[model samples]
Target: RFLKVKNWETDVVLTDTLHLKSTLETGCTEHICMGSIMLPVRTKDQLFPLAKEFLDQYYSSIKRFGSKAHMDRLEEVNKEIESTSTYQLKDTELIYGAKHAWRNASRCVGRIQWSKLQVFDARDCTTAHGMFNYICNHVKYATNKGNLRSAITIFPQRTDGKHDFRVWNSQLIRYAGYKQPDGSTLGDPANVQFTEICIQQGWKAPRGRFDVLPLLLQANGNDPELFQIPPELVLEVPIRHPKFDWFKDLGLKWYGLPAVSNMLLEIGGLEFSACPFSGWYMGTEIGVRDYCDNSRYNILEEVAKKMDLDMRKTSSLWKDQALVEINIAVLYSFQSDKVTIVDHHSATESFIKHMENEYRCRGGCPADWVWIVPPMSGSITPVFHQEMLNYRLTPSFEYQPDPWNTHVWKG
Candidate 1:
């Protein structure tokens, strides 16, 4: 069987049987077996190169600032690298490393404030309960009474040389999706499989449009533990149109914070699989992608109908008009609710500023054009016409295989 390679920014999976044959013939599985047990073949290949690069960059950056002792300590760690698989990172190393990762994240358009990220060191947590407590604090502090701050909480690293700790949920706050008998969905269609898995795992799925899924936490080969998110900690905005008074009757709502939980934080060769990070919402993320995407909400026609648009004719551009209004509604709703949200126009401008600053500061900025362009009003944003390049950067966030059986979760 061939193995699949996944892209983190785009949810694309690829593999080739021809490539697999070559891989098998080459005996390219170094560091595959440790202490009579097999690990993921890709783990060592991925982390080793990352470790080397991180050390070089880390040492160079510190040396510029006249920090000599830390570099000496890192050199000592490097010497011991041959004896042990894991490298110990000091608290200061982690704090700056996390910020550097944010700056190096190619998919993120909000890198302007990368230095302002509040990194929480929770590497000592070993239980699901401990994870829950850390996540609770992260939410509370990040929320900051609607003045949201970008933050990240780093949990225990992969010291055992295996995938030990993982947050199963995609994001810390998300609407639960429940499928109906006739294959229709009651909530966000993107989360239908996740919601069903939670239900099967003894969770009482609330039959509501905006029900938040519980945190599915696992540590050290144990069965996953489920912890319900407190209702008060979740900040939600009721979506309503600016002009249509009846729009509020749809009962549409969404969480304020987009704290991604499942992504792995890779810093200087070490992988923190349970690091959850949060950033304030860019209006298009919720407005265009989440609520208006065909696979997610598919609400264009419903919105067109509500607005009494000419949906029968393709020439009328009903879908386009509905999309704009839906996005407008999302932006208006968040502002009316006093929630922290950034419009696509403003965010795009800020990103261009970030690009200019990074070009001067770091000589270059890595960005993906497809990701940097706003979903709505692409032609109007400066990023739409600007050429961009994407490349691999160490000390970054990455996607990993799901902690649970995907077949069971998707069933």
Candidate 2:
């Protein structure tokens, strides 16, 4: 029965206890045990092996620099793990695990400096209000007056096989998408559902495209709480063209820091579902995909018309010219603002160096080829020619099921 249901592009499970029932678009339904719908928890035997490996590294690293008492304490924890099915990490272990998670994040091109990540320990925070405060601190520290820094704030890890804390916002900084009355979108289409959800929670969403969405956090299975971001903490750059003066009239802008808030941080066989991390943007991420894609801002046609490029024929190469100009404008605007953004060329070179360093350090680097290659001018970048292999790595950031989809909205 499950095999037949799997053909619907989703996994469907039937259980004797009807904890939850969800139906897929393809007419397949899953009757899952209530708590089983949550994210997976590795079995004790499955976790213990990886746990030992992580503990060994943790123990050896601390033995070199930690005091004898510290070493003994860690050693005791490590020793105790042999007989126990589960273990808890101390503060230092958690910090180290956070850094290692960054290093093992295969999609991050900026992992070369993963060791430099500023990890904030917020594991004791068990309320949405506490999460809001810690996230604010993360934004302030990562923003750093445009000199952005890579950082992550880790919340409590999932213990007792339950998701404890959840951050509903996709990013700590994202432009609000407002679906207009006329069947059009204003800011970001990707965030319209989330924006609506926030609005339903009694937030006064300023019906504008660039308004930053507030944090929607939940703890201990409680209702999601909304917290607005302080404007000054967010550094955004107004996009403008280098030569075309009218380009500035477009009134487009984006946040300086791309602090991803949704991904689960896994370390030492434990998952911190509410961990938020940030890395500076590579210009193409904004210029090429977010704004230029047809389903997104869909500005290529307008831009081509502005440039008076003939759209009558593909031979005119209007799209290609406009795309390059858009990227140039993005890089120029960020540089003019003195914000920390890397051009695709520079970013690709840096990623190449990162791969080489990782190869020497770990014998291999896990990278998604499509992601590592620059969105624009893919064939020209060094990363384009280099073959890459991606494999699952422990202590990594992983995409999880959307929190909104799993739980019913209270508001």
Candidate 3:
């Protein structure tokens, strides 16, 4: 009985990845798993077949398939592609496609709420002027006055490459980062490049730590024009702890809607270069990454100092204690303001439920362990211990190159 392993090599635990095949090409090899970076979309074949595959997926959703509506639409698309290489997606198809893209988001821990996403189809928009109005409306509604909701506004697709619509800024709302003459960034350092770009485009830099950057909209492949987000449309919640009154003196605040602006939305093989998506903030995302990270606001030392934690020592658990309270302040502030935010614990638990739900229903749920794992408290988290496989799924949101820099693909 001593030192005996039962069926050591013969009965190893194995799980099936099933039939969730990745349409895109991954960069990682079998020996090394690099789950942090993006994968290239393999654009192999003609447009009609890509459309047909998406149609197949679309009809599969409905058990009783549209007899004429299905076949009639396919033949119609076939001819449209024969004459013109691109065929526009109907409003209904676009809406469903957007939701499916969200469902196929492997990096998002919040994909459990994928089915409830609101899709705004703005494919008919031609000019940057039209794009502005569509974006403004998206922010106004998706903001929801602190009761945050998930939504995406899709602009025209990458039809023939030149007609591609793009949001130059990375996020819908991000603070300006001013690099000083002495070399320290005054705000979120992540926005340094974009904030510089905004300034050169004639945006008057207020030189504030929390100044929201203007939207740089580019449509029909023209140069970007800047537009400031209306102050009334944006909602900022002040961060304060439930127990500590001194925490309020820090005078920190964050936006309600954490909307992503510069990611590509790929439905079937069609690429929407300017589809911006929004959702309520995850507490740790604000407390840890945005506020406490050394490259971010770097408020951990200040927060720990305020608590009279021994700054000179490492074994006092100062950083750990400070992290908990900061996160608490993030959650409590959202609660007091009636702004919707999910704590990492709740998000992780909900993800566990989502994984089970996907496994039972779809057999495989693609997950990138690096992104899904909460940055804070990794070992204690359930997802950290679980073995996850990340495969790029179709109807996916992918990263794209800059509008100015068009990298040659398939050359």
Candidate 4:
């Protein structure tokens, strides 16, 4: 009545994907399946105010750290990061614990119409800073089992190495209005076609020398060429000075000397993979025979109707590609005196402590979590789907040694 049992048998089946086209033409439905989860922002409107308050307070404190001296400015930035912000909180292990919740949230993700799928709807997008924290949790969970194959994907657009496609900035989407038409049938009309909402072409033109650079040069420079595509993009390189690591071997004795490590960053740069966080979309398999037998066929029509999306208009990749993403938000060193041999350790400790407070202070919303729940049946196409199924999972966890170890695990 249940799946076949064997010493090594897994309740979770894995296999090659099936063909949706052929099965449909044969007039024999295969009942293709996929797994989906959604994490709704529980504190939506409330979270924004909390975020706004934190940002405002952080900005207000900038004056305490601001100075005309280059070194002073650097110190200010680093100290601020190390002391007052969650950006540096990675040091607190609990900050990373949020990932389990993120993964659980990912499991709750529901399916959207194929055309409705935006980059934001993906496993990584919904998780945000939460994704990074969850990743740490995942690593800890998998430490003894095996290392994960991690790489970042800055796809959907090329970054030119400088800008990322996944990150967003408000400056890029500045909103302004021009006089527009008003509805009226009498006389010369309230307004005409000349007065209508439209984007200004003058604003669309690129400005100044900052935009000029060859693709090959950009690539050689470790920058990515972006735009001309859509969805998400990634960057996987360290943004810090490259020589920082090299000097680690030289005993940082150079830092004790004045103005030593300053020029080190000029020549050396952080290296990046082709991208970060696993590359591109990979493949997965799910047994179709068992899937058809176990799923509820009765809800097919309703599910299909709910999934209706117009690929031509909804979430059109062509239209969305215009939005430029600068870079993924990354936590980096806020300490500026690392260049000074004497101040290095103190500076580093201050930075570490600041990050810890940031993490501890973080509250509200299920902010850190994400997951990659692959298709249950080996097919991208779906003739049917549902958010909440009437059936249950048949309580399979009872026999397992520990169902509490609910993070992603392979049977």
Give me the runs in candidate 1 sitting further than 4 Å from their true place.
1-52, 64-71, 161-163, 406-411
Per-residue lDDT of candidate 2, residues 262-327 (tens digit): 998877778888888897988899989988988788788888889999899999999989998888
lDDT of 1 by residue, 280-370 (tens): 9998898788988988877887788998999889899999998888888999999998889999899988997787666556656666676
Whole-model lDDT per candidate:
0.78, 0.77, 0.82, 0.20
lDDT, candidate 1, equals 0.78
Model 3 per-residue lDDT tens digits across residues 280-344: 88899999999988998989999999999997887988998898899999999999999999998
Pairwise TM-score winner, candidates 1 and 2: 1
Ranking by lDDT: 3, 1, 2, 4
Candidate achieving the largest TM-score? 3
TM-score of each: 0.85, 0.84, 0.91, 0.18
Task: Please list all clashing residue pairs in model 2, or write none if there are none.
Answer: 19-34
Candidate 4 ranges with C-alpha deviation above 4 Å: 1-87, 94-98, 108-148, 151-276, 279-282, 285-411
Quote the lDDT for 178 in model 3: 88
Q: lDDT score, residue 289, model 4?
A: 14
Candidate 4, 161-251: lDDT as tens digits: 2322222111111112232245322111111111121112112313221121111101222221222111111111122223233212211
Q: Give residue 278's error in model 4 in angstroms.
A: 3.1
Question: What range of 10 consecutive residues in model 4 has the weakest lDDT sum?
Answer: 259-268
Write out the backbone clash pairs for model 1.
none
